[PDB]
Design a protein around this motif. Structure first.
Motif, mmCIF file in Angstrom:
data_model
loop_
_atom_site.group_PDB
_atom_site.id
_atom_site.type_symbol
_atom_site.label_atom_id
_atom_site.label_comp_id
_atom_site.label_asym_id
_atom_site.label_seq_id
_atom_site.Cartn_x
_atom_site.Cartn_y
_atom_site.Cartn_z
ATOM 1 N N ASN A 42 -89.846 -35.420 48.348
ATOM 2 C CA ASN A 42 -89.727 -34.191 49.118
ATOM 3 C C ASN A 42 -90.645 -34.151 50.338
ATOM 4 O O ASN A 42 -90.467 -33.281 51.192
ATOM 5 C CB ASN A 42 -90.008 -32.993 48.187
ATOM 6 N N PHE A 43 -91.599 -35.079 50.447
ATOM 7 C CA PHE A 43 -92.647 -35.060 51.470
ATOM 8 C C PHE A 43 -92.964 -36.488 51.874
ATOM 9 O O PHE A 43 -93.178 -37.340 51.007
ATOM 10 C CB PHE A 43 -93.913 -34.374 50.946
ATOM 11 N N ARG A 44 -92.961 -36.760 53.179
ATOM 12 C CA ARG A 44 -93.438 -38.038 53.703
ATOM 13 C C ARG A 44 -94.163 -37.812 55.026
ATOM 14 O O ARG A 44 -93.836 -36.889 55.772
ATOM 15 C CB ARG A 44 -92.292 -39.033 53.906
ATOM 16 N N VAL A 45 -95.139 -38.677 55.318
ATOM 17 C CA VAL A 45 -95.924 -38.626 56.550
ATOM 18 C C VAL A 45 -95.901 -40.014 57.167
ATOM 19 O O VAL A 45 -96.097 -41.009 56.461
ATOM 20 C CB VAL A 45 -97.384 -38.178 56.317
ATOM 21 N N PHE A 46 -95.643 -40.076 58.469
ATOM 22 C CA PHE A 46 -95.556 -41.305 59.242
ATOM 23 C C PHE A 46 -96.645 -41.320 60.314
ATOM 24 O O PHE A 46 -97.009 -40.274 60.858
ATOM 25 C CB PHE A 46 -94.206 -41.426 59.951
ATOM 26 N N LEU A 47 -97.133 -42.518 60.639
ATOM 27 C CA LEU A 47 -98.051 -42.744 61.758
ATOM 28 C C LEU A 47 -97.375 -43.732 62.701
ATOM 29 O O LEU A 47 -97.113 -44.881 62.321
ATOM 30 C CB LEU A 47 -99.405 -43.271 61.269
ATOM 31 N N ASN A 48 -97.060 -43.281 63.913
ATOM 32 C CA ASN A 48 -96.295 -44.089 64.869
ATOM 33 C C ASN A 48 -95.088 -44.747 64.209
ATOM 34 O O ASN A 48 -94.796 -45.920 64.438
ATOM 35 C CB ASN A 48 -97.173 -45.153 65.535
ATOM 36 N N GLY A 49 -94.383 -43.996 63.373
ATOM 37 C CA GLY A 49 -93.168 -44.503 62.781
ATOM 38 C C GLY A 49 -93.342 -45.311 61.515
ATOM 39 O O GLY A 49 -92.335 -45.726 60.924
ATOM 40 N N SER A 50 -94.568 -45.533 61.062
ATOM 41 C CA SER A 50 -94.817 -46.310 59.856
ATOM 42 C C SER A 50 -95.371 -45.397 58.766
ATOM 43 O O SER A 50 -96.206 -44.530 59.031
ATOM 44 C CB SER A 50 -95.780 -47.464 60.141
ATOM 45 N N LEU A 51 -94.870 -45.568 57.548
ATOM 46 C CA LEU A 51 -95.160 -44.625 56.475
ATOM 47 C C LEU A 51 -96.620 -44.737 56.032
ATOM 48 O O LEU A 51 -97.145 -45.839 55.848
ATOM 49 C CB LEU A 51 -94.205 -44.892 55.304
ATOM 50 N N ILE A 52 -97.289 -43.591 55.868
ATOM 51 C CA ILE A 52 -98.666 -43.573 55.379
ATOM 52 C C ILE A 52 -98.865 -42.632 54.198
ATOM 53 O O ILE A 52 -99.960 -42.594 53.641
ATOM 54 C CB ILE A 52 -99.680 -43.237 56.496
ATOM 55 N N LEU A 53 -97.842 -41.877 53.796
ATOM 56 C CA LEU A 53 -97.890 -41.102 52.563
ATOM 57 C C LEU A 53 -96.454 -40.817 52.125
ATOM 58 O O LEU A 53 -95.629 -40.412 52.951
ATOM 59 C CB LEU A 53 -98.667 -39.798 52.756
ATOM 60 N N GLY A 54 -96.163 -41.041 50.842
ATOM 61 C CA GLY A 54 -94.842 -40.831 50.267
ATOM 62 C C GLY A 54 -94.094 -42.134 50.025
ATOM 63 O O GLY A 54 -94.562 -43.232 50.346
ATOM 64 N N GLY A 55 -92.880 -41.991 49.461
ATOM 65 C CA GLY A 55 -92.106 -43.142 49.006
ATOM 66 C C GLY A 55 -91.203 -43.705 50.089
ATOM 67 O O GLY A 55 -90.796 -42.993 51.001
ATOM 68 N N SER A 56 -90.880 -45.005 49.974
ATOM 69 C CA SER A 56 -90.080 -45.724 50.970
ATOM 70 C C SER A 56 -88.682 -46.012 50.414
ATOM 71 O O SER A 56 -88.507 -46.943 49.616
ATOM 72 C CB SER A 56 -90.763 -47.025 51.396
ATOM 73 N N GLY A 57 -87.686 -45.237 50.866
ATOM 74 C CA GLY A 57 -86.329 -45.336 50.349
ATOM 75 C C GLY A 57 -86.208 -44.802 48.930
ATOM 76 O O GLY A 57 -85.158 -44.953 48.289
ATOM 77 N N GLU A 58 -87.277 -44.158 48.444
ATOM 78 C CA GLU A 58 -87.398 -43.726 47.055
ATOM 79 C C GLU A 58 -88.549 -42.726 46.928
ATOM 80 O O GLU A 58 -89.391 -42.581 47.823
ATOM 81 C CB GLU A 58 -87.623 -44.925 46.119
ATOM 82 N N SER A 59 -88.567 -42.043 45.782
ATOM 83 C CA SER A 59 -89.580 -41.072 45.388
ATOM 84 C C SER A 59 -90.857 -41.791 44.932
ATOM 85 O O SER A 59 -90.843 -42.979 44.594
ATOM 86 C CB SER A 59 -88.999 -40.172 44.288
ATOM 87 N N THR A 60 -91.979 -41.062 44.931
ATOM 88 C CA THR A 60 -93.274 -41.668 44.629
ATOM 89 C C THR A 60 -94.106 -40.744 43.740
ATOM 90 O O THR A 60 -93.731 -39.606 43.460
ATOM 91 C CB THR A 60 -94.028 -42.027 45.916
ATOM 92 N N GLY A 61 -95.261 -41.251 43.286
ATOM 93 C CA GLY A 61 -96.093 -40.542 42.333
ATOM 94 C C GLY A 61 -97.194 -39.704 42.982
ATOM 95 O O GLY A 61 -97.328 -39.621 44.203
ATOM 96 N N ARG A 62 -97.995 -39.078 42.122
ATOM 97 C CA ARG A 62 -99.009 -38.121 42.553
ATOM 98 C C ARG A 62 -100.035 -38.766 43.481
ATOM 99 O O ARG A 62 -100.348 -39.955 43.373
ATOM 100 C CB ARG A 62 -99.743 -37.522 41.342
ATOM 101 N N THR A 63 -100.585 -37.955 44.384
ATOM 102 C CA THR A 63 -101.632 -38.427 45.285
ATOM 103 C C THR A 63 -102.947 -38.511 44.507
ATOM 104 O O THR A 63 -103.541 -37.484 44.151
ATOM 105 C CB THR A 63 -101.740 -37.502 46.496
ATOM 106 N N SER A 64 -103.388 -39.737 44.215
ATOM 107 C CA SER A 64 -104.631 -39.972 43.490
ATOM 108 C C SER A 64 -105.835 -39.954 44.438
ATOM 109 O O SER A 64 -105.689 -40.139 45.652
ATOM 110 C CB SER A 64 -104.552 -41.308 42.765
#
Ligand SMILES: Nc1ncnc2c1ncn2[C@@H]1O[C@H](COP(=O)(O)OP(=O)(O)O)[C@@H](O)[C@H]1O
Ligand SMILES: O=c1c(O)cccc2cc(O)c(O)c(O)c12
Ligand SMILES: [Mg+2]
Ligand SMILES: [Zn+2]
Length: 429
Positions: free
Chosen positions: A238-260
């Motif tokens: 439900n949430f993703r963050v990108f830096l200059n187009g490259s992923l830095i938080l969240g899942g890639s083509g898929e869902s991901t787990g809790r922020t540790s």
């Protein structure tokens, strides 16, 4: 004066494949960002149809007969030759009249060869989630793709571009008279919260999400920031963050787990040189930025009105579906919905599908810091007081897709399974 070739449509060939790189994918489409040096494509992405591994002539069919009739209000729409033109025309002729054109800009079609789609398929297989490659690859028997602006970039430099994607889900509770007595929890718990339990049962997520869509869609700036903080805590898909187009938080083509804590420390540091705050404080500032831009933009209010085109809930609308496809209603065994004029049963089902486009779509927010020397001012900005910074922002909808008529049956069976499991799980007091 020289002689030039006559106008012709662009076709992408094997050469041009290498100019694109994996960005992501959902259930229907693969998306690639342009890493080349042409001005046509700088700051664009391309959307390519996946194949999940026809009418009364053997010729393949774009829309079924029932679908041509459901959508007949627009003659160009039901005349679409391929799915690319259908999607342009759906967005242009159905969605934009309801949302407006400021936060929506449909794509531009382009032709592609078979070797181009074979290159792209081999290129990306290494970076795709494994259960995605199990279920689908590029449909290389197609000849068109869609070009779109890359909404993780603010400028089509001298400072980073940070952007977020939010898949907000359905933000209201149903009030239908057609919801049965046994199923009354649907009127007080959101579909998203009940669905989480079923997702855990099937090992699709590792923890229940903190995110509640009724918060984000509430119109309260306190509830909104709370939703943004829950999204950061349990992003899933439900949430993703990108830096200059490259992923830095969240899942890639898929869902991901809790922020540790480890994840958070890495993210806190990735924000250096965008948020001007001492260590351990940039994350709190960034989530206020996102919250302020979501609330300040106002984009969620009109989106919620489209979702509420689902007026009768799927428990009501499914009866109109079986009239449409001229079938004996399996649910009943009700002379109310089934006594409606054909035209009204059709309108109910069509508006159900439009609501589903709006329940399923995403929002992307790109930011520009005025700290950067080559930044340019605009009229849409957030002022971050604890940091004495100003960020300009853009908001755009993505994934405004036409849903197939026959998924009505799937919607009904999933709903029935969600509410039954939640009912059972709660009985266990
Ligand atoms: N116009 C765009 N600009 C930037 N990123 C995009 C754009 N469209 C899609 N993406 C990225 O690619 C992902 C998959 O695209 P999407 O159209 O949602 O696929 P599907 O239709 O299969 O769900 C998105 O979640 C998003 O991260
Ligand atoms: O989780 C999803 C969901 O919970 C609801 C509806 C539609 C979806 C569509 C997708 O393409 C997808 O990848 C999803 O992951 C979902
Ligand atoms: Mg999607
Ligand atoms: Zn019925």
């Amino acid at each position: 004066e020289v002689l030039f070739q006559g106008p012709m449509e662009m076709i992408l060939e094997e050469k041009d494949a290498s100019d694109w790189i994996y960005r992501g994918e959902g259930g229907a489409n693969l998306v690639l960002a342009y890493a080349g040096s042409s001005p046509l494509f700088v700051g664009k992405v391309i959307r390519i149809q996946k194949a999940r591994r026809k009418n009364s002539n053997g010729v393949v069919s774009v829309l079924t007969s029932d679908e041509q009739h459901l959508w007949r209000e627009n003659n160009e729409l039901i005349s679409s030759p391929n799915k690319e033109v259908l999607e342009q025309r759906y967005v242009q002729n159905v969605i934009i009249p309801l949302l407006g054109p400021k936060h929506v800009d449909a794509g531009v079609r382009v032709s592609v060869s078979k070797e181009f789609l074979e290159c792209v398929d081999k290129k990306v297989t290494k970076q795709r989630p494994l259960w995605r490659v199990n279920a689908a690859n590029v449909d290389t028997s197609h000849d068109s793709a869609l070009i779109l602006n890359d909404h993780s970039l603010f400028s089509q430099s001298g400072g980073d571009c940070i952007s977020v994607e939010i898949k907000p889900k359905c933000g209201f509770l149903p009030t239908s008279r057609f919801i049965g007595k046994e199923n009354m929890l649907k009127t007080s718990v959101s579909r998203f919260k009940m669905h989480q339990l079923l997702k855990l049962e099937y090992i699709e997520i590792s923890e229940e999400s903190e995110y509640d869509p009724l918060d984000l869609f509430s119109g309260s700036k306190e509830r909104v920031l709370e939703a943004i903080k829950a999204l950061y805590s349990t992003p899933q898909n439900n949430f993703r963050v990108f830096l200059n187009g490259s992923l830095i938080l969240g899942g890639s083509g898929e869902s991901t787990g809790r922020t540790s804590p480890e994840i958070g420390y890495a993210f806190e540091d990735a924000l250096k040189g965008f948020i001007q705050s001492e260590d351990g404080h940039r994350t709190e500032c960034f989530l206020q930025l996102v919250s302020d831009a979501v609330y300040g933009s106002g984009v969620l209010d009109r989106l919620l009105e489209i979702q509420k085109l689902d007026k009768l809930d799927i428990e009501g609308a499914i009866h109109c579906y079986y009239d449409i496809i001229n079938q004996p209603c399996p649910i009943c065994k009700e002379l109310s919905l089934h006594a409606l004029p054909l035209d009204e049963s059709l309108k109910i089902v069509k508006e159900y599908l439009i609501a589903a486009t709006a329940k399923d779509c995403s929002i992307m927010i790109s930011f520009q810091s005025r700290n950067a020397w080559d930044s340019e001012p605009s009229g849409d900005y957030v002022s971050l007081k604890p940091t004495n910074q100003t960020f300009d922002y853009k908001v755009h909808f993505i994934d405004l897709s036409l849903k197939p008529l026959k998924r009505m049956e799937s919607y009904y069976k999933l709903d029935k399974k969600i509410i039954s499991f939640y009912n059972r799980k709660q009985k266990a007091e």
